[PDB]
Amino acid sequence: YNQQDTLDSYKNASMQGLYIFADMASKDMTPEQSNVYRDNSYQQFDTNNVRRVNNRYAEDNALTLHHNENGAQYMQWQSYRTRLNTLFARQLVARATTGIDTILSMETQNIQEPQLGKGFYATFVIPPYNLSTHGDERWFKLYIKHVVDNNSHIIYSGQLTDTNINITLFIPLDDVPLNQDYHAKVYMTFKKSPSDGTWWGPHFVRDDKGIVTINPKSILTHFESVNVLNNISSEPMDFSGANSLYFWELFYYTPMLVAQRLLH
Amino acid sequence: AVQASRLAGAAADLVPNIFGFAGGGSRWGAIAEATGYVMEFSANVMNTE
Amino acid sequence: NPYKSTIRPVIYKSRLYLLWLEQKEITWQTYQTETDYRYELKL
Incomplete structure (x- = not known):
């Protein structure tokens, strides 16, 4: 589909498309046939400024990905926003310049996440x-x-x-x-x-x-x-968010694994 | 010796080798390829030694 | 592989970074010799 600034414009967009089958043969879609799939799911099409998330076909806004100017990426659905990336590793380099004792320190675990x-x-x-x-x-x-x-x-x-x-x-x-x-x-x-x-x-x-x-x-x-x-305009690093696994991976598991290995 | 040989081949490869109405033809990746080969051999020599 | 040894280190966010300017040159005859340049700054 051609990029347009508003969903209201996709309502009559000249939708190109094709079909892919399980054997990975394909067929082109008829314009009528493409326009059916257009009119049922025109809201999921991305805009020039807003990127949306696709869904399985059906026959109450869509999920959405915003790249904030501060560098936070988040997913939005209705009132709910959830963070996707973390700027911890980009702020950590200053902590790493003074070595391991500073990587594992308490204030390192209080590097701020920019708000989303x-x-x-x-x-x-x-x-x-x-x-x-x-x-x-x-x-x-x-x-x-x-x-x-x-x-x-x-x-x-x-x-x-x-x-x-x-x-x-x-x-x-x-x-x-x-x-x-x-x-x-x-x-x-x-x-x-x-x-x-x-x-x-x-x-x-x-x-x-x-x-x-x-x-x-x-x-x-x-x-x-x-x-x-x-x-x-920021909040503490999140030990329950998306990267919670990597953050528990580093601050607690890695020291404990190293100490356990050094014990033997 | 292999490091010098690969670096020499990389440097000798960046010069263009097609000319006429068509130009260029040199391998822009030759330096990264030579650095890859010499790093590849480094693990082998550290294993042998 | 810089053009004319145009390489200059910099520290950014307390980490060491390198900028250098590569030039890819291409030439052919047309008698007259034509030349194409594409200058590419690498970080």
Whole structure:
């Protein structure tokens, strides 16, 4: 297909294609026959600026790959973004210039990952568990809303401690907001009060410059504190993400394997 | 001796060998090929020795 | 394999890097001699 800036243009694109069979013979596709496959799955076609992910043919946006300007690659689907590459090894060279004792050090494991997409880092403080406020089941869930679509999504799930819990989350923000008064909504649910209230959690809004603030109309009672880390555009290296295996591969397994070999 | 021989062949290979209305023809990869051959032989000589 | 020993080291991100300029030259007759150059900076 010819590259076009909008999905609206693929609706009438002169789709070329062909068929490949199990014996790896092929046949050309008839224009009518190509246009069927076009009209069913024109949304999966890549744009000039946005790269999409293909799917098995069928007869709610597609998965997408963004190459951010800061160097983070991430996969997006609806409100969810997940990192793909890691810039750890590109920052490590400075640590390697002073040798092994610095590679394995603690601050090395705190090299920052640049943030992915557009969003703000927010710190949420979970109030102490109490039976009267939260009920007998200690579960709680953080939900995000009014990002991409009105339907809410889960962003964190946990158990209420007697202590506070400090939870720092990257909150995605859309290219253009759905609502002018609040650009994102976050509410926390538990056993006692699983239902959401219209204003009953932190609402976030963003001005023309990159600063985010909490809407005073929203009610913070379900949180012991909410803070927006407007100065932060990065997060710690992730021992649970995609490269989690390689990071456990290096920081713990390799020293332990070496020590075990030196023991014998 | 083999390192000198391969480097000499690489350097003697980069000169063009077709001329007329058609030009060029030299092997731009000859230096990387010679470095590959000499590295290949290095493992063999370290094994023998 | 630089042109005219145009090689210059640099340190980038605390690692040693090499830049050199290669030139691939091609010539033929047409009597007049034509020449093609393609200058290629390697890192």
